[PDB]
Curated annotation (Swiss-Prot), chain A:
Described function: Plays a role in a RAD51/RAD54-dependent homologous recombination repair (HRR) pathway to repair MMS-induced lesions during S-phase.
Protein name, per record: Suppressor of HU sensitivity involved in recombination protein 1
One cellular-component annotation, GO: nucleolus
Domain of life: Eukaryota
Alphabetical GO biological process terms: DNA recombinase assembly; error-free postreplication DNA repair; maintenance of rDNA; positive regulation of single-strand break repair via homologous recombination; recombinational repair
Major location category of this protein: nucleus
Compartments, as annotated in UniProt: Nucleus
Keyword DNA repair carried by entry: yes
DNA damage is among the record's keywords: yes
Curated annotation (Swiss-Prot), chain B:
Keyword DNA damage: yes
Keywords, ordered alphabetically: DNA damage, DNA repair, Nucleus
Name by which UniProt lists this protein: Platinum sensitivity protein 3
Protein's gene: PSY3
Keyword check for S-adenosyl-L-methionine: no
Curated annotation (Swiss-Prot), chain C:
Role according to the record: Plays a role in a RAD51/RAD54-dependent homologous recombination repair (HRR) pathway to repair MMS-induced lesions during S-phase. Required for error-free repair of spontaneous and induced DNA lesions to protect the genome from mutation.
Name this protein carries in UniProt: Suppressor of hydroxyurea sensitivity protein 2
Keyword Protein biosynthesis listed: no
Subcellular location: Nucleus
Superkingdom classification of source: Eukaryota
One BP annotation, GO: recombinational repair
UniProtKB/Swiss-Prot annotation, chain D:
The species this protein was found in: Saccharomyces cerevisiae (strain ATCC 204508 / S288c)
One of the protein's GO biological processes: meiotic chromosome segregation
Name used for this protein in its record: Chromosome segregation in meiosis protein 2
General function of this protein: Involved in chromosome segregation during meiosis. Promotes efficient recombinational repair and functions in the protection of the genome from spontaneous and induced DNA damage like mutations and gross chromosomal rearrangements (GCRs).
Family label: Belongs to the CSM2 family.
Length: 146, 210, 205, 186
């Protein structure tokens, strides 16, 4: 589904007491989109339990360059005590990545290998076209790191 | 210098960048023709004044898959006989004075699941349509601004509307008249914040724009 | 072919204190594009590091690689070029940042059909338990006890993977030959995050 | 006239002592449940004379009934609140099952005198606040859904304090409590 579709269903999901989500917003285009209100057309909350989630259980983080994404996840997996996420949505990773033939492989494999190695259900929106090289790298590393 | 970028990275709640669905007061016919139909779909704070003790035939209609929190100070709505099956009731000693009403309303906002647990709600996947506090005149004898403050935060947070009742000015004279813009004593700080005020005259209801 | 490369790498050490030349003569002819000597060069040339997150060092390397040890470590190869970033080497998943890996990884995609799955192109899956190999070289964890995975290192391999393979995918004594017996391969424990973060700072830009 | 059917607060105009005593009897003698009558009076006039006639204290069955009749006399709102405070601790204990289900009847007589006397030592602001804290408390206590302890309240006033009622068939306490506090009448 679409980013804002899976984001919507995660706040309003039923409570196991619930998911604890982290949304990683990558790229400046995506940041403008989220900060300046483009989301709130497409994601709302109605449930008491959704309202709490939208406040206490879903965390948004903005990172502007892939270098800091790598450093951030590297810091994430390095602490024993630290917030534990059941879902990690990575938004806009394809935008950052342009895009030479072998420089694209090395960056994505490093980035992809770092994300999927987290104790969460990690997902990348927008979904990259099925036949595209990032989409094929994502499937490959998912099988490897599963 | 990216070690310093990493040091200043900041976490935000989703709620900053998204809306909560608002619920609006539709009206029953009895009250309807005091405002533009465009002003009738913006209705988030209504306050009704009436001389009855039990709630009027219009107020019961304002209340009736979702749920509605009735803070019942009078101990009327929550009597076993009259409980509607769409309602959540808070009836308690701590809530008879305006300080304990706020502390609850603050608990509803700060930690809503503990609030609704104190109401025998153990399951929270539901929409809280609105809150109903009946009746305000018993609250202060000895803040009415603080109460509206927290009531607005509950409307932004949970998207519910607000309905309030208070007695007309005859109640505030007292027993044997010993206690002596709007025909009730609610300070205009509170009364301002209300989208629509309604007076009940004996068998008719009329708005107050003063 | 028919070989178990894992045991064959154990045949480079006898114990002693220099590499058995019979075996090293064989291993040379088994890898293309000069892979075995550069793997061996790197091993003696003190550009190999193994960083750990923090009872003995040699013991916890033994525990992880030679046998429920979940250890946070890093296999780095520092570049003499010096205006060049470090080299991150993952033998568990068979991946390296080096230009050599990423060229033939790319070539593997150009030889491919773009509707083929990478897993098919780059990995030998064996699900018939009777064909299970004791070879640990270029082995991946399938996340199944019903299967065995091996990367096709004929299709993609680099001098730093073979290198660390020789170190960590053969006998303990080949491990001790390069670490406790000599330091041709450095092993540094690291007790603080800021230092851990600082190893990674130029791997991406 | 029976406990299951009482409203949380009920006003009784000028009660006929025959119907009062026949009402205490009809209930306090109910079986399987221990029902008590707390009679709180400003003037100290319980209909004792006619009561002994109906429920003779020598008959062995009636001994349990006087066991459940608590006469008390308090002169002002201040002591009325301490009676209701005790009444809350009685109901708290019996809610723990720490039994036969309790049923209390609070019967207050000439409350407007108890208001009056308080209205000297205290201000009318304080007085209405006291009256308020108590009646709203009693209404919550009565509305409580635990059935191992119940309470019902009855306020008897002489019908000429209720003058405003008989029309629809100053503002007096009995009148002011009729519109703003009690559930039903008679
Ligand atoms: Zn390499």
């Amino acid at each position: 589904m679409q980013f804002e579709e899976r984001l919507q269903q995660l706040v309003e999901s039923d409570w196991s007491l619930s998911p604890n989500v982290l949304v990683i917003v990558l790229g400046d285009t995506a940041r403008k989109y989220v900060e300046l209100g483009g989301l709130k057309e497409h994601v709302t909350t109605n449930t008491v339990a959704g309202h709490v989630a939208s406040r206490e259980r879903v965390s948004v983080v903005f990172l502007g360059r892939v270098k800091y994404l790598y450093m951030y996840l590297t810091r994430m997996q390095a602490q024993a005590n630290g917030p534990q996420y059941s879902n990690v949505l990575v938004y806009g990773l394809w935008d950052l990545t342009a895009q030479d033939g072998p420089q694209q492989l090395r960056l994505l494999s490093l980035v992809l290998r770092q994300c999927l190695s987290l104790p969460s259900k990690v997902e990348f929106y927008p979904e990259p076209p099925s036949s595209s090289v990032p989409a094929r790298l994502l499937r490959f590393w998912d099988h490897i790191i599963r | 210098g990216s070690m310093e970028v990493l040091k200043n990275i900041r976490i935000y709640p989703l709620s900053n960048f998204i809306t909560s669905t608002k619920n609006y007061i539709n009206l029953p016919n009895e009250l309807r023709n005091l405002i533009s139909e465009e002003q009738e779909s913006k209705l988030g704070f209504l306050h009704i004044i009436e001389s009855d003790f039990k709630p009027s035939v219009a107020l019961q209609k304002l209340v009736n898959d979702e749920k509605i929190l009735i803070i019942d100070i009078v101990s009327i709505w929550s009597q076993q006989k009259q409980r509607q099956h769409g309602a959540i009731y808070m009836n308690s000693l701590s809530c008879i004075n305006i300080t304990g009403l706020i502390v609850f309303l603050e608990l509803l906002y700060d930690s809503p699941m503990d609030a609704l647990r104190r109401c025998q709600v153990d399951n929270f996947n539901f929409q809280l349509r609105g809150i109903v506090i009946d009746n305000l005149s018993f609250l202060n004898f000895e803040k009415f601004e603080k109460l509206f403050k927290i009531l607005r935060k509950l409307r932004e947070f949970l998207g519910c509307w607000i309905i309030t009742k208070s007695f007309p000015t005859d109640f505030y004279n007292g027993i044997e008249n010993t206690l002596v813009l709007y025909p009730t004593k609610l300070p205009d700080s509170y009364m301002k914040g209300m989208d629509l005020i309604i007076y009940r005259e004996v068998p008719q209801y009329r708005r107050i724009a003063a | 072919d028919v070989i178990e490369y894992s045991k064959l790498f154990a045949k480079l050490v006898n114990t002693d204190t220099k590499l058995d030349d019979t075996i090293a003569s064989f291993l040379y002819y088994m890898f293309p594009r000069e892979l075995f000597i550069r793997a061996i060069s790197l091993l003696e040339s003190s550009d190999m590091f193994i960083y750990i997150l923090d009872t003995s060092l040699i013991d916890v390397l033994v525990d992880e690689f030679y046998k429920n040890s979940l250890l946070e470590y890093r296999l780095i190869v520092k570049d003499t070029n010096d205006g060049a970033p470090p080299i991150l080497v993952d033998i568990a998943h068979w991946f390296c940042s080096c230009e050599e890996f990423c060229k033939y990884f790319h070539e593997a995609l150009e030889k491919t059909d773009e509707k083929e799955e990478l897993h098919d192109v780059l990995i030998n899956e064996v699900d018939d338990h009777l064909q299970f190999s004791d070879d640990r070289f270029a082995q991946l964890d399938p996340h199944s006890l019903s299967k065995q995975w091996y990367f096709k290192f004929d299709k993609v391999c680099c001098s730093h993977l073979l290198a660390f393979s020789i170190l960590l995918r053969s006998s303990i004594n080949v491990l001790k030959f390069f670490t406790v017996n000599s330091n041709k391969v450095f092993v540094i424990a690291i007790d603080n995050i800021d230092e851990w973060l600082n190893l990674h700072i130029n791997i991406v830009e | 006239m029976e406990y299951e059917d009482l409203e949380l607060i009920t006003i009784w105009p000028s009660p006929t002592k025959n119907k009062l005593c026949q009402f205490i009897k009809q209930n306090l003698s109910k079986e399987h449940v221990v029902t008590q009558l707390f009679f709180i009076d400003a003037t100290s006039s319980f209909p004792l004379s006619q009561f002994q006639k109906l429920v003779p204290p020598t008959l062995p069955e009636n001994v349990r009934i006087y066991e459940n009749i608590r006469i008390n006399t308090c002169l002002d709102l201040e002591e009325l609140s301490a009676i209701t405070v005790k009444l809350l601790q009685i109901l708290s204990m019996n809610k723990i099952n720490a039994t036969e289900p309790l049923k209390i009847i609070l019967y207050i007589n000439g409350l407007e005198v108890m208001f009056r006397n308080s209205q000297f030592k205290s201000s009318p602001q304080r007085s209405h606040e006291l009256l308020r804290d108590t009646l709203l408390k009693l209404r919550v206590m009565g509305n409580d859904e635990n059935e191992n302890a119940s309470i019902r309240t009855l306020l008897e006033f002489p019908k000429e304090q209720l003058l405003d009622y008989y029309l629809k068939k100053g503002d007096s306490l009995a009148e002011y409590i009729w519109k703003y506090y009690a559930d039903s009448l008679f």
